[PDB]
């Protein structure tokens, strides 16, 4: 269906997200480092971004729109299957980096929460 928005809200939001995405390609302290093991890094990112949506739905969904998470699938030829996981990991990571940059007070809450899994 096609709807007429005289205030162009959907389109204004798309321009904002694009300004946020661009403003980081160009141009809050954390308590731990993410796992170096790539499988564990993926699992860590899935848990953290999933918690961001539960604790901070609007902030999370802004960061995920900046990161383009909506294309990706949660965790055919193996080349493209693994590229899917890599693409998912890149977007989860960009979500976290966007939260760190624009929602620092959310990031510090999620940083203390994820520290409990780190040791
Ligand atoms: O993971 C975070 O620290 C975070 C913070 C705000 C929004 C999205 C996020 O993933």
């Amino acid at each position: 269906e096609n709807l007429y928005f005289q205030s162009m809200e959907p389109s204004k939001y798309r321009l904002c997200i694009d300004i946020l995405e661009r403003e980081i390609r160009r141009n809050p302290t954390c308590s731990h480092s993410m796992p170096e093991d790539l499988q564990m890094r993926l699992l860590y990112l899935e848990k953290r971004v999933g918690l961001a949506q539960l604790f901070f739905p609007a902030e999370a969904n802004v960061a995920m729109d900046v990161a383009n998470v909506e294309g990706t699938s949660e965790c055919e030829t193996p080349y493209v299957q693994t590229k899917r996981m890599l693409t998912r990991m890149k977007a989860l990571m960009k979500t976290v980096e966007t939260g760190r940059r624009y929602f620092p007070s959310c990031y510090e809450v999620l940083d203390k929460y994820m520290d409990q899994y780190m040791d």
Side-chain angles (χ1 to χ4, degrees):
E1 283 47 47
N2 241 339
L3 290 57
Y4 179 61
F5 298 79
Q6 46 208 139
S7 300
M8 322 179 82
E9 300 79 336
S11 170
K12 298 190 307 173
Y13 179 67
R14 275 185 266 110
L15 292 172
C16 280
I17 294 308
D18 273 9
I19 291 160
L20 292 188
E21 196 222 334
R22 284 197 308 275
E23 208 76 13
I24 65 175
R25 274 287 196 250
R26 199 272 304 310
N27 182 338
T29 183
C30 67
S31 53
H32 60 269
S33 267
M34 298 187 324
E36 266 269 320
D37 179 295
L38 269 190
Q39 186 59 55
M40 297 296 109
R41 191 177 295 234
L42 178 54
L43 291 177
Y44 173 111
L45 285 170
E46 286 285 357
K47 174 138 219 65
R48 189 180 172 131
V49 173
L51 288 172
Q53 299 164 264
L54 284 185
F55 293 146
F56 313 112
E59 293 80 356
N61 286 253
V62 166
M64 287 165 84
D65 291 330
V66 180
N68 293 295
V69 176
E70 190 277 313
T72 73
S73 322
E74 176 167 49
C75 310
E76 43 275 81
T77 77
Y79 187 109
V80 175
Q81 187 281 91
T82 305
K83 301 219 301 194
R84 186 185 304 124
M85 277 174 73
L86 300 190
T87 297
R88 175 72 169 178
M89 189 165 338
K90 156 87 159 288
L92 295 176
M93 190 61 160
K94 198 168 173 186
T95 311
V96 169
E97 183 70 17
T98 300
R100 186 182 68 59
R101 166 80 163 93
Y102 296 125
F103 307 105
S105 75
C106 295
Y107 176 99
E108 52 199 25
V109 165
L110 288 164
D111 209 83
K112 306 324 144 216
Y113 191 104
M114 294 306 295
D115 199 62
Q116 309 170 306
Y117 301 84
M118 297 312 299
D119 200 86

